[PDB]
Curated annotation (Swiss-Prot), chain C:
This is Small ribosomal subunit protein eS17. It is linked to Diamond-Blackfan anemia 4: A form of Diamond-Blackfan anemia, a congenital non-regenerative hypoplastic anemia that usually presents early in infancy. Diamond-Blackfan anemia is characterized by a moderate to severe macrocytic anemia, erythroblastopenia, and an increased risk of developing leukemia. 30 to 40% of Diamond-Blackfan anemia patients present with short stature and congenital anomalies, the most frequent being craniofacial (Pierre-Robin syndrome and cleft palate), thumb and urogenital anomalies. The modification Phosphothreonine is found at residue 129. HAMAP family: Ribosomal_eS17. It is found in: Cytoplasm; Nucleus, Nucleolus. It comes from Homo sapiens (Human). Keywords: Cytoplasm, Diamond-Blackfan anemia, Isopeptide bond, Nucleus, Phosphoprotein, Ribonucleoprotein, Ribosomal protein, Ubl conjugation. Belongs to the eukaryotic ribosomal protein eS17 family. Component of the small ribosomal subunit. Part of the small subunit (SSU) processome, composed of more than 70 proteins and the RNA chaperone small nucleolar RNA (snoRNA) U3. The lineage of its organism: Eukaryota, Metazoa, Chordata, Craniata, Vertebrata.
Swiss-Prot record, chain D:
The modification Phosphoserine is found at residues 275, 277-278. GO terms for cellular component: cytoplasm; cytosol; cytosolic small ribosomal subunit; dendrite; extracellular exosome; IRE1-RACK1-PP2A complex; midbody; mitochondrion. This is Small ribosomal subunit protein RACK1. Phosphorylated on Tyr-227 and/or Tyr-245 by SRC. This is required for binding to SRC. (Microbial infection) Phosphorylated by vaccinia virus B1 kinase on serine and threonine residues; this phosphorylation remodels the ribosome properties, favoring the viral mRNA translation. Signal peptide: none annotated. Changing residue 129 to A: Decreased binding to PTK2/FAK1.
UniProtKB/Swiss-Prot annotation, chain E:
There is a cross-link at residues 40, 52 (Glycyl lysine isopeptide (Lys-Gly) (interchain with G-Cter in ubiquitin)). Keywords: Acetylation, Apoptosis, Cell cycle, Cell division, Cytoplasm, Cytoskeleton, DNA damage, DNA repair, DNA-binding, Isopeptide bond, Lyase, Membrane, Methylation, Mitochondrion, Mitochondrion inner membrane, Mitosis, Nucleus, Phosphoprotein, Ribonucleoprotein, Ribosomal protein, RNA-binding, Transcription, Transcription regulation, Translation regulation, Ubl conjugation. The modification Phosphoserine is found at residues 47, 62. The gene is RPS3. The keyword Ribonucleoprotein applies. This is Small ribosomal subunit protein uS3. Component of the small ribosomal subunit. The ribosome is a large ribonucleoprotein complex responsible for the synthesis of proteins in the cell. Has endonuclease activity and plays a role in repair of damaged DNA. Cleaves phosphodiester bonds of DNAs containing altered bases with broad specificity and cleaves supercoiled DNA more efficiently than relaxed DNA. Displays high binding affinity for 7,8-dihydro-8-oxoguanine (8-oxoG), a common DNA lesion caused by reactive oxygen species (ROS). Has also been shown to bind with similar affinity to intact and damaged DNA. Changing residue 47 to A: Reduced phosphorylation by IKKB. There is a cross-link at residue 52 (Glycyl lysine isopeptide (Lys-Gly) (interchain with G-Cter in SUMO2)). Belongs to the universal ribosomal protein uS3 family. Methylation by PRMT1 is required for import into the nucleolus and for ribosome assembly. One of its GO terms (cellular component) is ribosome.
Curated annotation (Swiss-Prot), chain F:
PANTHER family: RIBOSOMAL PROTEIN S7. It comes from Homo sapiens. The keyword Kinase does not apply. This is Small ribosomal subunit protein uS7. GO terms for cellular component: cytoplasm; cytosol; cytosolic ribosome; cytosolic small ribosomal subunit; extracellular exosome; focal adhesion; membrane; nucleolus. NCBIfam families: PRK04027.1, uS7_euk_arch. There is a cross-link at residue 32 (Glycyl lysine isopeptide (Lys-Gly) (interchain with G-Cter in SUMO2)). It is found in: Cytoplasm; Nucleus, Nucleolus. The modification N6-acetyllysine is found at residue 32. Belongs to the universal ribosomal protein uS7 family. Component of the small ribosomal subunit. Part of the small subunit (SSU) processome, composed of more than 70 proteins and the RNA chaperone small nucleolar RNA (snoRNA) U3. One of its GO terms (molecular function) is rRNA binding. InterPro entries: Ribosomal_uS7 (IPR000235), Ribosomal_uS7_CS (IPR020606), Ribosomal_uS7_dom (IPR023798), Ribosomal_uS7_dom_sf (IPR036823), Ribosomal_uS7_euk/arc (IPR005716). Component of the small ribosomal subunit. The ribosome is a large ribonucleoprotein complex responsible for the synthesis of proteins in the cell. Part of the small subunit (SSU) processome, first precursor of the small eukaryotic ribosomal subunit. During the assembly of the SSU processome in the nucleolus, many ribosome biogenesis factors, an RNA chaperone and ribosomal proteins associate with the nascent pre-rRNA and work in concert to generate RNA folding, modifications, rearrangements and cleavage as well as targeted degradation of pre-ribosomal RNA by the RNA exosome.
Length: 138, 62, 132, 314, 65, 189
RNA sequence: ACGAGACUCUGGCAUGCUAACUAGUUACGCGACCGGUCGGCGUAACUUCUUAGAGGGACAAGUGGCGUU
């Protein structure tokens, strides 16, 4: 089923297909325990063990990713996982524990549900960068 | 060199040649009856507590 | 800077002057009514005029607004000013009157009035403020 | 007169509740629409611990929801949104099966036939759109129609000949029969725009309110002022109860409930934010309703909650 | 609005003393439906339509057909 | 559990400054498994203190036009020396970190004060935020110069400076900077 | 009254809507494991996942502390 509601950061995005499966989370043919930077795995296991590894009781989540930058994909892959968990937990099951885990991860941080609207600004001529300008000649 | 407590209750204004300091009113927690003025350097929040060497210092006053 | 310019303020002033009853209590009703009866080219401007309409109406609940000349405000002012007690403040049994104004009354053919009372004159003539 | 005692409070929502739905076959679960673009099914506990918890929230609107209805079962619903759309939700699966668009601007209220076969939608474009449930854009009245917005349309809940009534912002109401699409009556007498008009479930007592600040009564089949009723200014909601002669009117930042025998107030309920100074305003009420059996009062407010009041006899 | 409400032409004049440069800038009034000025109104200005009168009988009355 | 890097316990920290835990926080709910959350606190004011101080470190030993844009390297290099202070002092690195932040944190500084004169300086009180900023700056300056051109690698020069600043030892470059600030505060009343 | 503002493209939510065969993930075997995993891709194919359209949305609108209130 496709209850995917984006989950984004910068120009990279993730779509978290969710179904009633095995409880194994897959990221485009590779497990979330093994990602190319080899450094942000804790950033990926943060949501699940923050809310509880016991929650996944036969739910197969495959996230497909596309965009620029690896770390830019992260903070959205995990956002997509949290969105898929929210959609699953809103579709049928109760809300009291949903609100409990939501409060816990909201006090944990804010980049698990709501995307960062930030983006790279254009560069203005007459300088090397958007805000930096060349040196003054005396 | 005795040290006591002081916490901000009124941000009187900004002082310094180029906005260096904040002239702020601070109360001593151990006495909760005295208000003194300090040209505290740095971003100051209304209600922060800091350990100080000085308990009687005053600066330029207007 | 969130200062609202003369365009927003003046358009809201004209709207509340003109369609005071047509307004609503919620901002989202206010923008809809404003867009109904005003040629406002863009969404942002009609939003800004609607928002100042909400703020002006909030100011209405406590008093008049200087630039507005609605008839209902005059009716409200004239109803508020229509207050009267059962006893006039000038209706009192004893009126303290100095001897000099008593002589003024007596030369005015009103020295026979028994409603007044003798208040003694001041001890001295120390009424000027000190000089310099 | 019955005391309206404190059952508790409901919280856990972030939007003004505008339309509150009660189904006269499920006194345990009811629907309520809130203008944070959502419509939510409650769970009713009816104990001192807590009033209840939301059950299922359905969202399909780009803008806020104005009015909602339920067709004949807690598995169906029809919801009108501020974007000018109508959506038929199938609450057996929590999805929308049909969409209805014949308007160019906002829709204030939607009506539905007591036989669940006619859809009536009142918009801001001075046009009332009447569809059949088959999906045919069947009719609108455009000859000397309402000259302003259509604030609300309500239908007779009694099994009888269908009879529509529509309140406009031109300080007038129009009662029509859709069998012949011929004007039946046009009423004036308020001193302001109307917001809600509801019909008692026999076509006898018609209630009107809004910026006039006074509830005004007509007969669906006679056409005359039934009585002059005095009440709080600005009626944000008014309606009868389809079990008893009580009329509940949401007037000002509070609500009144009256009888028609002698026109006296049984319980004046004010929800107040108390400030030590002149600092705020009371949370104003938006909608009033009774339960499925009509013994508990639900009030949808702008403080992001639906308040519940219980009958205890006091 | 200088894109449409203002129309501009630059030109040169070649006399026996030299060259004279002119610019002519003509503003177009508001003429919707008629093609003399731009169809769209000036974006920064607001106009409030005249009020619609009231008829408020103190005694409610009905209008049967 | 919310232990740092999943291996350093976070339910053991004691700032012991009466009321300063709002301006130096590693227990706060913003403290996460990793010190990497991308820059979002620098935009507004008094939000910088809501940062998990691990992030402020991994970005403060992150400077000098050769490191900017290499934050994953900073997170690896803080994992390094976190697991090294885990063994050098045999205690949780957060305890020595709060000790360093509570001692190295300056109180008195000297600044030019006056509208019409330029002769001398006046003593001023450095607020907690600026004090932690300049203390971490001195720590990072020492850690850069302690491994600059030197055979000593990172995570040990930083480690040495951290340990000999956390106990109050004046042998630290940061603590000697603190002493210099205090003495120039003495000499410009 | 000109300028500023307003304007316009927009960065940023379209889960709502017109809608792709130069776009794209899931109903049966194609080379492997008692049910899971492929950008040579499985018959079947829905707008969520990229483009580009209309409407909506954010207003110091809500609360608190200051302010010639």
């Amino acid at each position: 089923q496709s209850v995917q509601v984006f989950g984004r950061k910068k120009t990279a995005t993730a779509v978290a297909h969710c179904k009633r499966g095995n409880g194994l989370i897959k990221v485009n043919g590779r497990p979330l325990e093994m990602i190319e930077p080899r450094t942000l795995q804790y950033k990926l296991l943060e949501p699940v063990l923050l809310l509880g590894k016991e929650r996944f009781a036969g739910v197969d989540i495959r996230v497909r990713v596309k965009g620029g930058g690896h770390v830019a994909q992260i903070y959205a892959i995990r956002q997509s996982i949290s969105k898929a968990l929210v959609a699953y937990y809103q579709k049928y099951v109760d809300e009291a524990s949903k609100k409990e885990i939501k409060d816990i991860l909201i006090q944990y941080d804010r980049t698990l549900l709501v995307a960062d609207p930030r983006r790279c600004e254009s560069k203005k001529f007459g300088g090397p960068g958007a805000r930096a300008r060349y040196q003054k000649s005396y | 060199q005795p040290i006591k407590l002081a916490r901000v209750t009124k941000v009187l204004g900004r002082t310094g040649s180029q906005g260096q300091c904040t002239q702020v009113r601070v109360e001593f927690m151990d006495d909760t009856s005295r208000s003194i003025i300090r040209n505290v350097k740095g971003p100051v929040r209304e209600g922060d507590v800091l350990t100080l060497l000085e308990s009687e210092r005053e600066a330029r006053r207007l | 800077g969130r200062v609202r310019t003369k365009t927003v303020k003046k358009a809201a002033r004209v709207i509340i002057e003109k369609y005071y009853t047509r307004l609503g209590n919620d901002f989202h009703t206010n923008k809809r009514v404003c867009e109904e009866i005003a040629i406002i080219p863009s969404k942002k401007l009609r939003n800004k005029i609607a928002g100042y309409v909400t703020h002006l109406m909030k100011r209405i609940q406590r008093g008049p607004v200087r630039g507005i000349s609605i008839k209902l405000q005059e009716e409200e002012r004239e109803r508020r000013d229509n207050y009267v007690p059962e006893v006039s403040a000038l209706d009192q049994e004893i009126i303290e009157v100095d001897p000099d104004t008593k002589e003024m009354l007596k030369l005015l053919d009103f020295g026979s009035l028994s409603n007044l009372q003798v208040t003694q004159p001041t001890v001295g003539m120390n009424f000027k403020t000190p000089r310099g | 007169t019955e005391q309206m005692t404190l059952r508790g409070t409901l919280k856990g929502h972030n939007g003004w509740v505008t339309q509150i739905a009660t189904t006269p076959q499920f006194p345990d679960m009811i629907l309520s629409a809130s203008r944070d673009k959502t419509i939510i099914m409650w769970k009713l506990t009816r104990d001192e611990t807590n009033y209840g918890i939301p059950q299922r929230a359905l969202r399909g609107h780009s803008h806020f929801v104005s009015d909602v209805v339920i067709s004949s079962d807690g598995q169906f619903a029809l919801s009108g949104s501020w974007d000018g759309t109508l959506r038929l939700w199938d609450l057996t699966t929590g999805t929308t099966t049909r969409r209805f668009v014949g308007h160019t601007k906002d829709v204030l209220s939607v009506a539905f036939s007591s036989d669940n076969r006619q859809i009536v939608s009142g918009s801001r474009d001075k046009t009332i759109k009447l569809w059949n449930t088959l999906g045919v854009c069947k009719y609108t009245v455009q000859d000397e129609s309402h000259s302003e917005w259509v604030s609300c349309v309500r239908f007779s809940p009694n099994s009888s000949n269908p009879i529509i009534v529509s309140c406009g912002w031109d300080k007038l109401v129009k009662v029509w029969n859709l069998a012949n699409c011929k004007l039946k009556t046009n009423h004036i007498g308020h001193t302001g725009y109307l917001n809600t008009v509801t019909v008692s479930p026999d076509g006898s007592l018609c209630a009107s309110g809004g910026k006039d600040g006074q509830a005004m009564l007509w007969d669906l089949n006679e056409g005359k002022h039934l009585y002059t009723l005095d009440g709080g200014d600005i009626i944000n909601a008014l309606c009868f109860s389809p079990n008893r002669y009580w009329l509940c009117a949401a007037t000002g930042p509070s609500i009144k409930i009256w009888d028609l025998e002698g026109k006296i107030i049984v319980d004046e309920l004010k929800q107040e934010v108390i400030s030590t100074s002149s600092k705020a305003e009371p949370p104003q009420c938006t909608s009033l309703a009774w339960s499925a059996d009509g013994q508990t009062l639900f009030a949808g407010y702008t403080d992001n909650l639906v308040r519940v009041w219980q009958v205890t006899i006091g | 609005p200088v894109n449409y409400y203002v129309d501009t032409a630059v030109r040169h004049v070649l006399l026996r003393q030299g060259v004279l440069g002119i610019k002519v800038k003509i503003m177009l009034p508001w003429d919707p439906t008629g093609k003399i000025g731009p169809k769209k109104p000036l974006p920064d200005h607001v106009s409030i339509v005249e009020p619609k009168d009231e008829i408020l009988p103190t005694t409610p009355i009905s209008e049967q057909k | 559990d919310i232990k740092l890097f999943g291996k350093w316990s976070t339910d053991d920290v004691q700032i012991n400054d009466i009321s300063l835990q709002d301006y130096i926080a590693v227990k706060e709910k913003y403290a996460k498994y990793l010190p990497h959350s991308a820059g979002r606190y620098a935009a507004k004011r008094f939000r910088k203190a809501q940062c998990p101080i691990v992030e402020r470190l991994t970005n403060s030993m992150m400077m000098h036009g050769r490191n900017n844009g290499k934050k994953l390297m900073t997170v690896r290099i803080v994992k390094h020396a976190f697991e090294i202070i885990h063994l050098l002092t045999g205690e949780n690195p957060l305890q020595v970190l709060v000790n360093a932040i509570i001692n190295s944190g300056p109180r008195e500084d000297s600044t030019r004060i006056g509208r019409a004169g330029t002769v001398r300086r006046q003593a001023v009180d450095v607020s907690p935020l600026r004090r932690v900023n300049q203390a971490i700056w001195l720590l990072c300056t020492g850690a850069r110069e302690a491994a600059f051109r030197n055979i000593k690698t990172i995570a040990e020069c930083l480690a040495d400076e951290l340990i000999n600043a956390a106990k109050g030892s004046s042998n630290s470059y940061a603590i000697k900077k603190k002493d210099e600030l205090e003495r120039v505060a003495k000499s410009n009343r």
